[PDB]
């Protein structure tokens, strides 16, 4: 039931994800080292981690079918408002539910609830973020559904500042129909609808997590001693 257009969209997104995600986490060696034990000892390391992730999300977004047809202003708008959500989505690949942490190779590069707190964030964000990672991990998504959810997350028409909302909607509709057909090719009803309904609910939870992170990022970045430890890309992308 998967068309040739839908099969090509899936192959491109999987190719894009494989090019923009290194499961070896070798590039973590070049970040500023993590300090677990002034009080925000994990801010430098996690700032480089987010800065690195933003670059990967931009590269992945550029390879989404139809993304380049947008104007530069719309590409910037979609990426500024979705980068935080895609980072939380793509981080699920390293999330393990043994200790509720992101395991990326070593114990140096294994981050838990305390590690996020050593970056300036309260549990008003960390607790819903952990709940999100568990509920997302329990969905047991294929890599095809994972990459389609990331592309649908990026190409959203209801982002503030979007110029050609109809064009963004038309691109998202093709990615959504590709996702709905893939779920039907793998799961009979009514489980197919229940899976797709939970996936869209995760996109709604991302908007809530986006608002909470933005609230705390503004509080942290307003302090010059904290924004001094950020990266130029983070200040440009997360700053508005």
């Amino acid at each position: 039931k998967l068309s040739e257009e839908q099969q090509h969209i899936i192959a491109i997104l999987l190719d894009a994800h494989h090019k923009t995600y290194d499961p070896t986490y070798a590039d973590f060696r070049d970040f500023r080292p993590p300090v677990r034990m002034s009080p925000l000892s994990m801010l430098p390391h996690l700032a480089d981690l987010v800065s690195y992730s933003i670059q990967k999300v931009i590269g992945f977004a550029k390879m989404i079918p139809g993304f380049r047809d947008l104007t530069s202003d719309d590409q910037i708008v979609l990426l500024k408002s979705s980068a935080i959500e895609v980072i939380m989505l793509r981080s699920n690949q390293s999330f393990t539910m043994d200790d509720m942490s992101w395991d990326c190779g070593s114990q140096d590069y294994k981050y838990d609830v305390t590690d996020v707190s050593k970056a300036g964030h309260t549990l008003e964000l960390i607790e819903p973020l952990i709940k999100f990672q568990v509920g997302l991990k329990k969905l047991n998504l294929h890599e095809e559904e994972h990459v389609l959810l990331m592309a649908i997350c990026i190409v959203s028409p209801d982002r503030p500042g979007v110029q050609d909302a109809k064009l963004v909607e038309a691109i998202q509709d093709r990615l959504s129909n590709t996702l709905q057909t893939y779920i039907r090719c793998r799961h009979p009803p009514p489980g197919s609808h229940q899976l797709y309904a939970k996936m869209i609910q995760k996109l709604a939870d991302l908007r809530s997590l986006n608002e909470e992170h933005s609230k705390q990022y503004r509080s942290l970045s307003f302090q010059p001693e904290n924004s001094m430890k950020l990266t130029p890309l983070v200040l440009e992308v997360f700053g508005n």
């Binding site: 550029k62 590409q75 910037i76 990426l79 890309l233 440009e236 992308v237 508005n240």
Partner: peptide
């Protein structure tokens, strides 16, 4: 504001 680093990463 302008986003020169974002634009450079967007080819």
């Amino acid at each position: 504001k302008n986003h020169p680093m974002l634009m450079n990463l967007l080819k």
